[PDB]
Ligand binder design. Structure first.
Ligand SMILES: O=C(O)[C@]1(O)C[C@H](CCCOc2ccccc2)[C@@H](O)[C@H](O)C1
Ligand SMILES: O=C(O)[C@]1(O)C[C@H](CCCOc2ccccc2)[C@@H](O)[C@H](O)C1
Ligand SMILES: O=C(O)[C@]1(O)C[C@H](CCCOc2ccccc2)[C@@H](O)[C@H](O)C1
Ligand SMILES: O=C(O)[C@]1(O)C[C@H](CCCOc2ccccc2)[C@@H](O)[C@H](O)C1
Ligand SMILES: O=C(O)[C@]1(O)C[C@H](CCCOc2ccccc2)[C@@H](O)[C@H](O)C1
Ligand SMILES: O=C(O)[C@]1(O)C[C@H](CCCOc2ccccc2)[C@@H](O)[C@H](O)C1
Ligand SMILES: O=C(O)[C@]1(O)C[C@H](CCCOc2ccccc2)[C@@H](O)[C@H](O)C1
Ligand SMILES: O=C(O)[C@]1(O)C[C@H](CCCOc2ccccc2)[C@@H](O)[C@H](O)C1
Ligand SMILES: O=C(O)[C@]1(O)C[C@H](CCCOc2ccccc2)[C@@H](O)[C@H](O)C1
Ligand SMILES: O=C(O)[C@]1(O)C[C@H](CCCOc2ccccc2)[C@@H](O)[C@H](O)C1
Ligand SMILES: O=C(O)[C@]1(O)C[C@H](CCCOc2ccccc2)[C@@H](O)[C@H](O)C1
Lengths: 149, 149, 149, 149, 149, 149, 149, 149, 149, 149, 149, 149
């Protein structure tokens, strides 16, 4: 699918509903709603739209990836903690043959606790953006626009 | 419980809803419905019935194992990604005292990425079948029939 | 929040709904309902009340932690299997700035299988109690009572 | 080769000559001769025949694998202790281009000592069946029948 | 022995004689004397008494455990550094067949340096309390009273 | 410095002089000169300029980071093989107090050989972009513009 | 069986046929026939006899262990290199229910190359003697004589 | 020194004072006094004498090794828990140039918990006897008598 | 011995009998007989002869090494799978004091599966040639010629 | 405290009483009395004194650290074997807030056995000197003199 | 390119300029000029020439590999210490599509320190010769002649 | 060479040119020129002179080490980041047969990031001084003056 004909799915994992409410030195002072606004703008800038979602449930994320697989032009995903633990989410993305996927982390996980350094999602994501703040979501959109082109 | 008196629960974990839609060289071109049909036949051949279910949700699979513990003669389980990650499903199966459990993987996980080599479920499953394709499910049923009688 | 003004949230993870039904040499013969009753009395003995919940779903536990963050005076959590696998629950507890958290394991996980020895939750929990049976929940409540005053 | 034209090679590694004489809780009370008779019946149930062999010598098993490579329709192998140590048997099976191979362990090796968890043979065996008792051999023959036709 | 007929041995390992003199954000500002008074009070509240001792010598602590084995109703031990290094103290506790043992750490060691995460003592201690401050000694006493009655 | 007052230093490590000449499926068919041209355009589109350089020599890269520290508004760096090996470049970037740094990899290093998964540079770079092709350089320029401007 | 009624089997693994021909500072100057003579002497001192064998073939050692199981009052084994590699010999000793087994190493393997530090045979051998020179075989014989009476 | 002119020092590490009082299936029913008596007679059987000591204190054991270095013809040492932890006792034995040293474990430490499998003392001890019960002390005396005569 | 007075022993490990019959991209399409013929001419070109042998049996290879130790001027060995598993063959080659030993692998084992990267034989072989095709045997012969001259 | 007002404590761990009686190539021919004299001299050159002590007992060393914390101007310590094993001594030193501490090893521990490479003391010691011979203690005195002024 | 039309590049890494000046029992007494003469002779015997170079600088070796890629018929490389550390040289070699590469080490790195056992270079070199002294360069030349033909 | 006859080479690795410009709490406020001046006076205090140099290039440091080998009486080296990565600098120092070498780190590397704990240079450096600040250079010079003496 192209940007013109289907939205980009923007998926957000656990706890990100609280973005902005603490640790601004690490994650900024923008809320999740502010991030959504940034993505709407960035997609529009490239002639597309987004479908922006958040969940604390691993299985829900899986279901939403199966939906993206049939209905969206690409996925930008910040899997949050499930980055480090979910093989299920990796396998869900693996079923998205041909679909552009960009993983985003607001923080630079490489500078944090050792368990945070690894991501299962990175094994499928076409591109991985870490430590660019909420601007990383914009880069995710920009990359999908380039690929679904 | 005997096969005569209660169904075999066949549980399928995340992403197996899409079986048949990709990677046929590894997983075959049969769909999950085709697998269900195979299981119905295999169980009938032995005078039993099946209760075949699939979920992308770890917690729903746990709930379902608690249901089998009370109501079913055995479990054949393809835990999918959760094989590698879910201590909660191992613990659920551990509550099934005396119930036959056979774990099944369509692919030979030992020939895949190193993180797929290990399974928590195998620590409780009475038998583990991997790399026998969808026929593995029929072996699961055949084992439970031998054990539940 | 003080004990006087808000309940203590007591969370229980997967499989603990079946407490009492097996392995009494390790977990005791009290049911989860008995445990809730113990907690109610322990909280009362210190001028408090509890909000006692159990779920097999990792996402629901996260959702509940976010509720406690805003509405409760502390958390006593037995994360069960999710102790060993859930970065998502660790992250949820980490959003609870200032809130007292005590992690409770009925069994002494240090005497069990190697994978049980480690807990993500212990990275945030203020106190960790293990192997004190269900009395551990009483210690959790007594700790929150000491800290939330 | 088909089942019609050539036997299934069934190979058994060291110590399995003493099967039935101890540890019946783990390995059953059937003797290796009883297993051979089970395999003859299982293969006949699918229009085939077997060539059933046992040796304590790694190099003899490699020799027999080379024989199967040219003269048999598939291999069912319980490599016993060599499963865990023999790169030579792995390399021998690797020479069997296109031949169906199923590895069988009577016990569920994933429940035993840590060194028993890993198998070189599993890196080539199409299918691996563990913890299904001597019925595993039946499943091995069933799989070969399905593949060799 | 019961609480009524013999004292609880409370053992404290190296450097704890200086408790209260530094790092109060981690260990609080109570002195060891203050901790002893807390233990006296807690034991009295359950009809018991304590025998409170501290040593910087691993072999003295071993001697004292042998004494408790014969003369006391239980042991509450904060082995301090020796928690991480002393198989000898673990072996001594292992000689105390039937005796209740609770291990206490004032700080939550799981949040500290990696070498502090593991304790040999926790392989024998019935219960392990970490990060509850000096109130963890009170939990120790409460647990022994529960078990020794 | 701001973008208006100083150029962005764009540094490329060993072997990137041959970009475009092989493995286009991984690295694209743009040459390093093409990438320079993209960076110059990207910077201009945010009111800045670039100082683009490539070297095969670890100590020359260190020298050039010292120069950036004093004369440039930020560093975009693709350290190539030295990402995995060079503590010296990490130390060099550490001296750049307050300067924005973005590391870029054309390929998704997390999908490649295990030694390629780790980067010393990511321990200082503010943001890390991987697998977004040459467009990742544009993202680096965009990030620096956001941080400097 | 007792010493009176059956010989002690003494088994020597690969390369021990050349004992005494090299490295005397490590292994001594006695030949394997001198070792056999020491064993004959030791057993006679205790009213027994020995059946002393050496082989370079793992499968042959397995076969001889099966013989001892049925025909000898105990096994003294120097498995040589196969100590470090042979799960098959371990499994063969494991079949020897009730039979006294002592493992002997002429050199102190714990002082040599790290791969020599571990032995699979020590997981079953009742006693293990290392670094006592050829007098270790004598200690072997003495141990069997104590146990087989 | 020879057996004729000086005693063999026999050192016993922590907790062995309690030998005989528990776990007889592992350690036997002999007391440490019984073992001292066994040693007196085994030395006399070879024209020697012994100086038999036990301590729970690592430094005392090092002090006694210094004394033996100057005053005794050999050392038989069961270091108990300190086998696994004490570099200080390894360094002490290392000062005993030319003195025969035999390490003894009553139990076969290679069949116990993993941390018990390794011994620092084995890095110097000339010989190491494990799993021969208290007879292992006799073998230690026998070896010293052979070396020091 | 010299090349003039004795043959070079050229030993080939398990499965090499089948060289030529598969995977020519890795191993070439020469048969083992063709390699033998290459060896004969390489040795003659330096005034020597060969004794060329192949076995699937570890023990036989050991026995043949003992023969070469007394009867031949050097050993060129491709231990095949046993390169990775056989301490026994290492120890056999260690008995060959002063005899030139060159290890050969047709394929570059360092580019293959991780378990293939390590060889016990290389701990004794004077020289190790890998990935030079069957020409590597020729280099082996050339090296023996150089050393035995 | 200044050098003018209190002595420097010089602590030596186990086995150093024997310094100079062996292994001169590693540790020199000076005795521990010679080392004391060198410290007296070095301290006097800087207007100070020393309190020079040696013990084989970990607990005594801890006791002496507590003494120094209150009574001395700094600590030079060669912990000997306890360097590698004693978290208790590290903890003792950690209580010496603000006190200068320099760790000395006569040998370069980095060139010795792997277990010797690591030191717990180095985690606190302000400075660590290894492989400078007995002259390392003069450097420790010189560093205390610099810091304590 | 063929040997007739272009020289073989022979590259030597750090410190090899001092070959011959020490450790002759490991590296021989030939100087690097002697090695160059051996390479000139061996190439001439096959109708070719060499371009022999040595550098202590990693980046200069990379530069020279790039030169070879365009101008030479093959590379024989002794990367010396950079074998073990340089992903940059590996990457340089990887750009040499279709070019024969042979890696040489004069000493048998597998008999040396553990860090020396691994080479990045070997992941690309076609052939790797180790432990054959300076004759290994001759094998390198002989291999390139065979492949360039 | 003696101190009287030739300068001590004092070599500084990458980034040290910026000493004094940041992180004074770890590295002090002296600049590299101030260090040089300190070394000049230290050497003069012992009748010697210094040749003080700094480079960011690994190969240049190796070249300088070869120069020292022929022309200088010793080496004091702070390899900075190359401590942790440069086998090349180790190998160069290894060529300096008989030459005294002391490694200096201004910061105590053992208290920093885990990768900084290890130094290849320390495998050859006779002495290693860490965490003594710039005074560590003076210790180096003092040690050289003692050894060249
Ligand atoms: O930095 C990221 O984007 C992460 O994906 C965020 C996760 C944390 C999710 C919650 O983020 C919040 C940040 C601030 C306030 C509330 C939630 C963490 O598990 C990953 O390791 C990195
Ligand atoms: O081979 C299996 O049965 C697995 O359990 C399947 C999982 C993947 C489930 C998704 O399977 C599909 C296969 C084809 C098409 C769609 C999904 C995988 O994570 C395990 O490692 C092995
Ligand atoms: O000991 C605990 O409380 C645990 O948190 C319990 C978990 C298991 C929960 C299920 O517990 C039951 C106990 C008795 C009967 C049924 C379930 C386990 O996964 C952790 O490793 C330790
Ligand atoms: O469970 C299996 O089939 C095994 O392949 C059996 C092997 C042991 C073979 C000997 O089996 C006997 C069973 C009963 C009685 C005697 C021998 C063991 O090494 C593997 O770990 C798993
Ligand atoms: O947190 C605990 O209770 C510990 O057991 C205390 C030990 C430290 C004993 C010294 O404690 C002091 C605390 C404050 C002031 C002085 C000493 C430490 O080694 C363990 O890792 C955890
Ligand atoms: O993907 C990247 O940008 C890297 O930084 C590139 C490096 C290789 C630089 C040379 O790349 C070329 C690509 C195409 C053609 C020639 C060189 C590789 O060492 C890193 O692992 C990832
Ligand atoms: O020390 C031993 O007895 C060994 O078992 C001997 C084996 C070596 C058998 C060959 O022994 C010889 C000794 C001297 C001369 C020839 C062979 C070795 O692989 C084990 O690690 C230790
Ligand atoms: O590459 C080599 O020469 C090996 O020594 C060959 C062995 C494989 C032997 C069988 O070789 C064949 C090759 C082609 C066709 C048949 C057998 C393998 O185990 C080693 O890892 C490396
Ligand atoms: O090199 C040192 O100073 C040590 O701290 C000394 C210890 C050994 C103490 C005994 O030193 C002696 C030297 C000569 C003679 C007797 C003892 C050792 O455990 C450390 O690894 C390094
Ligand atoms: O054995 C080889 O050729 C090496 O590549 C040599 C390197 C060292 C080259 C310096 O060699 C010299 C040998 C003698 C005299 C001077 C330098 C070493 O780092 C590798 O681990 C193995
Ligand atoms: O403590 C040291 O001397 C170090 O060798 C310095 C290196 C850092 C070199 C740059 O140091 C500067 C210090 C202050 C200001 C600028 C640079 C670091 O990589 C080592 O791990 C430890």
């Amino acid at each position: 699918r192209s940007l013109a004909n289907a939205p980009i799915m923007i998926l957000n994992g656990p706890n990100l509903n609280l973005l902005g409410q603490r640790q601004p030195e690490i994650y900024g002072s923008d809320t999740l709603a502010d991030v959504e606004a940034l993505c709407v703008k960035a997609a529009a800038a490239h002639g597309g739209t987004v479908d922006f979602r958040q969940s604390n449930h691993e299985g829900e994320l899986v279901d939403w990836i199966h939906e993206a697989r049939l209905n969206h032009c690409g996925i930008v995903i910040n899997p949050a903690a499930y980055s480090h633990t979910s093989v299920a989410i990796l396998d869900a993305l693996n079923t998205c043959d041909g679909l552009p996927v960009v993983e985003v982390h607001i923080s630079n996980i490489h500078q944090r606790e050792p368990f945070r350094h690894h991501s299962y999602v990175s094994q499928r994501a076409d591109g991985v953006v870490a430590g660019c703040g909420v601007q990383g979501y914009v880069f995710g959109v920009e990359r999908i626009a380039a690929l679904a082109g």
